[PDB]
Structure 1
Amino acid sequence: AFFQQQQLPAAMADTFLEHLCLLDIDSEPVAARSTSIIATIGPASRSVERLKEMIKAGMNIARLNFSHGSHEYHAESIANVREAVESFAGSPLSYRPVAIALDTKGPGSGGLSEQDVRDLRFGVEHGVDIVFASFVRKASDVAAVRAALGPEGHGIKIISKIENHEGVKRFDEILEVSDGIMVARGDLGIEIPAEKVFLAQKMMIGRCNLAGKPVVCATQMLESMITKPRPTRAETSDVANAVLDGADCIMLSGETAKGNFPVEAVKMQHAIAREAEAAVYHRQLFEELRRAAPLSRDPTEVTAIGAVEAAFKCCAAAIIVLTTTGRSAQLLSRYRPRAAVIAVTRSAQAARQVHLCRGVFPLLYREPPEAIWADDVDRRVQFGIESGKLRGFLRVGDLVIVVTGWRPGSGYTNIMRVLSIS
């Protein structure tokens, strides 16, 4: 029964053609949904009750579009998101952190516009986790956003939005200095011929997967759901194809901001992403990712590829990793394991930010530190196992891979352990 679920017959295929032939509509997805859902917050989804339903449906990141709306409006939206998120903080084994992202208005006619400087300052003051920098054309644009965040905004992730021809041409220099990329298809589809956008999407997803950096596919994914309760055949196909391409996050804009079915749009993306993740051809994908990743003498990098390889060998349910900054979880995520990466952290910001990485399920550990560090590490691993059993990831008898370091502080990951559940 196990080998007939989650497209396991199609996963055993020796060719991609044989893999397509073996895809089964009756082979049910078992794994948790890995691709994160970014929902834009607007009038259709601003109430605390609305937001609680959206978190339950699968929203991981809340986007604030600073193109329209006042600072007062956006501060109220942030307060509402935080209130809906913290309403679930009473049960720590099931708490789902939700990141807050600020989408800048952009340079328009102008370098960094004065409104952008004010909006970036607002973001730092309100503790946003991510910034979607609009119309990034070169590496110096990213540096300008980083300087506008100042010394207080060091921890904020900068995701560069590629929306025009120059951004696509200077992609490699932009990616080198950004934390991730957003394929902003709306403006891109106007700046370049509409029929070429899929080429830019596929090239950018490929290069981000190669770099190990998050990539977001955005705009008009379920557009018809703004007025209709069901998406078109092209829309469900578009979402599935962005996941198959290798997108870390999928986004909803007007569908959640102004539409009549914001919760239904989130549920629809959740349903499609789960099916698409099972249809991934891991045999070729893992080989190509493994081959392309450079040789490294960084123990975190070395332990990560050992852990992903071991997870494939035993069909591990999860890889539990201890992380301070999210880096150890991100290095596991780049090799695209089929096993869920349960990241246990004390940093609330790192817990929200790891939603950018496909397959990372953040767990915020709130307990106070133990006297003996080894015991504190062991307690955090047990917390990961308990939350895993509670959320359905783990069952007794399952194998898990545990990734830890030899000393406290970030950057010392070097241990991988094979563990039997209970």
Structure 2
Amino acid sequence: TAFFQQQQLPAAMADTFLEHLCLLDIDSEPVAARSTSIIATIGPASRSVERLKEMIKAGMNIARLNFSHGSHEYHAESIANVREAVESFAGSPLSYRPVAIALDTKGPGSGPGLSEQDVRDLRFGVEHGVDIVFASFVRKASDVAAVRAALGPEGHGIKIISKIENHEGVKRFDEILEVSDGIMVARGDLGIEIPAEKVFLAQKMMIGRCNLAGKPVVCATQMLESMITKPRPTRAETSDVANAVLDGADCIMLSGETAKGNFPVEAVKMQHAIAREAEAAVYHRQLFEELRRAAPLSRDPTEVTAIGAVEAAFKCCAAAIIVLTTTGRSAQLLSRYRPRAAVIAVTRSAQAARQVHLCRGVFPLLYREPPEAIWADDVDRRVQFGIESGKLRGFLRVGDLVIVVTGWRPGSGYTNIMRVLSIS
């Protein structure tokens, strides 16, 4: 078939990484959906409702609100505009794309503990329902603990992504990652605190440790910087985006390219285009083998089902792995093994649907329908919802094979079943 010369499949079947590089083809068109999420910073150039709709079409998955600048009234208005542009597509539930809201804090700024503004800003996040928090200048575990105690009673569900932007944060990394929900390689400040020529070492090390831990990792600053004023990026910029994906980053960020630049939609489209190409060029054979050898033995059925499903997906070239999820944990565990198959996550939790964008290859679907009396009937309708959406979005075709990860009883934490299905 033509199939075995599309998503860099000749290069993916190579026996060595050197042979894999030699088999990379510019004419091998990526077919799979773009898995690395795009975080776009919302500013003057992008807070228009009609502009936000354009950005969602372009591939924006997470909207970032930089709390360094702007008032609470400004940020609440930006949030409302994002939600209005997101809900304008809720008329066709088979094509609706959830979009997460992330609050990027100001920072401690030469002081002990959480700054007074950060305490006020985190309460604002709780009161406005932010899905993610990018905690600025995390240096130790206590910093993470402070950002989490700040999310008061009503906000323990918000995902804290610790921003590493100084030498101390890099040295105390393992202790930070243990208590954080993910990490952001905040390259701008990092490139000021540590020598500029050492930042790539910090990026590659942190991405690798995050991949091992199964926790999301974000590449953040100056990725397409020249696109603030120019319609096209530099050769170094497209290389940087592609290399962040190849390193193993779950998310790529635009901050200024979308916040204040002349080409915000073009920067999103560009990051989408590069990410698709870079994801097809990932050497899955070594990546999966190493992921397995490093990942410890688990007696958790969710984790055991995850490798079994990822292995099964590789064996048959599964178009997608469709997993039902309440908290997103099942989808996150599948994501850790970096399958070439899309992780279609079907969920009834609008928050979980937005928060799974932090995990690479997870494509969230929000199930809006009324429940069936028979739980088994309800599970099959949600599985069919993922198939119907996948078909519509081009992820699946009739005749394809899919892996369907489900649980034996309702409620989260009981995933234990994996099925091989033929799309009808």
TM-score band, normalised by shorter chain: over 0.9
Kindly state the Cα deviation for residue 278 of structure 1 after the two structures are TM-superposed: 0.4
- 1:116-169, Cα deviation, whole Å (9 max, x unpaired): 000000000000000000000000000001000011001100000000000000
**Structure 2: distance between partners of 1:12 and 1:39:** 34
Q: Name the residue aligned to 1:31.
A: 32
For 1:58 and 1:367, locate their aligned partners in 2 and report how far apart those are by CA, in whole Å: 25
- How far apart in 1 are the matches of 2:242 and 2:128? 34
Distance 2:135 2:49 in 1: 27
- Mapped partners of 2:97, 2:124: distance in 1: 25
Shift of 1:374: 0.5
244-253 or 11-20: which moved more?
11-20
How far apart in 1 are the matches of 2:64 and 2:122? 14
Q: Give the SS at the match of 1:186.
A: helix
Is it true that 1:93 corresponds to 2:94 in the alignment?
Answer: yes
Q: CA deviation at 1:76?
A: 0.3
Residues of 2 paired with 1:205 and 1:151: CA distance?
31
1: distance between equivalents of 2:76 and 2:285? 46
Q: CA deviation at 1:189?
A: 0.2
* Structure 2: gaps (5+ residues): none
Which deviates the most, 221-230 or 364-373?
Answer: 364-373
Output the CA distance in 1 between the equivalents of 2:13 and 2:310: 18
The superposition leaves residues 254-276 of structure 1 with CA deviations (integer Å, 9 ceiling, x where unpaired) of 10000000000000000000000
Distance in 1 separating the partners of 2:153 and 2:227: 41
Cα distance in 1 for residues equivalent to 2:215 and 2:85 = 29
Q: Distance in 2 between matches of 1:420 and 1:373?
A: 23
In 1: Cα distance, 2:410 partner to 2:169 partner: 40
Query: By how many angstroms is 1:368 displaced?
Result: 1.5
In structure 1, the partner of 2:284 is 282
Structure 2: how far apart are the matches of 1:368 and 1:2? 39
Report deviation, 1:108.
Answer: 0.4
SS in 1 for 2:61: strand
1:22-421 to structure 2, matched below 5 A, reads 22-110=23-111, 111-421=113-423
Structure 2 CA distance for aligned equivalents of residues 106 and 356 of structure 1: 22
Partner Cα distance (1:109, 1:245) in 2 = 33
SS at match of 1:147: helix
Structure 1 residues without counterparts, runs of 5 or longer: none
| Pairs aligned (count) | 422
Matches of 1:20 and 1:367, distance apart in 2: 46
Deviation string 1:190-247 (CA, Å, 9 cap, x unpaired) is 0000000000000000000000000000010000000000000000000000000000
3-state DSSP of counterpart to 1:274 = helix
Measured after TM superposition, the shift of residue 377 of structure 1 is 0.5
Q: Distance in 2 between matches of 1:384 and 1:7?
A: 26
SS at match of 1:166: helix
What displacement does 1:46 show?
0.7
Deviation per CA, 1:161-190: give whole Å up to 9, x if none. 000000000000000000000000000000
1:12 deviation in Å?
Answer: 1.1
The SS at the match of 1:131 is strand
Q: Deviations over 1:347-375 (max 9, x none)?
A: 00000000000000000001121111110
Question: Which 4+ runs in 1 deviate beyond 3 A?
Answer: none
* Alpha-carbon distance in structure 2 between the residues aligned to 1:233 and 1:244: 16
In structure 1, C-alpha distance between the alignment counterparts of 2:410 and 2:285, rounded to whole Å: 36
Matches of 2:383 and 2:87, distance apart in 1:
24
Deviation at 1:290, TM superposition (A): 1.0
Does the residue aligned with 1:380 lie in a helix, a strand or coil? Answer: helix
**Helix, strand or coil at the partner of 1:158:** strand
| Distance in 1 (alpha carbons) for counterparts of 2:315 and 2:178 | 33
Distance 1:321 1:8 in 2: 25
State the distance in 1 between where 2:65 and 2:10 align: 42
User: Following the alignment from structure 2 to structure 1, what is the Cα–Cα distance between the partners of residues 252 and 244?
Assistant: 8
Of all paired residues, the percent bearing the same amino acid is 100
TM-score normalised by the chain length of structure 2? 0.99
| Per-residue CA distance 1:266-318 (angstroms, 9 max, x = gap) | 00000000000000000100000011111000000000000000000000000
Partners of 2:205 and 2:398 in 1: CA distance: 42
Tell me which moved more, 8-17 or 322-331.
8-17
Query: What is the CA–CA distance in structure 2 between the aligned matches of 1:12 and 1:387, rounded to whole Å?
Result: 30
2: CA distance, partners of 1:406 / 1:22:
43
- Secondary structure at the aligned position of 2:45 is classed as helix
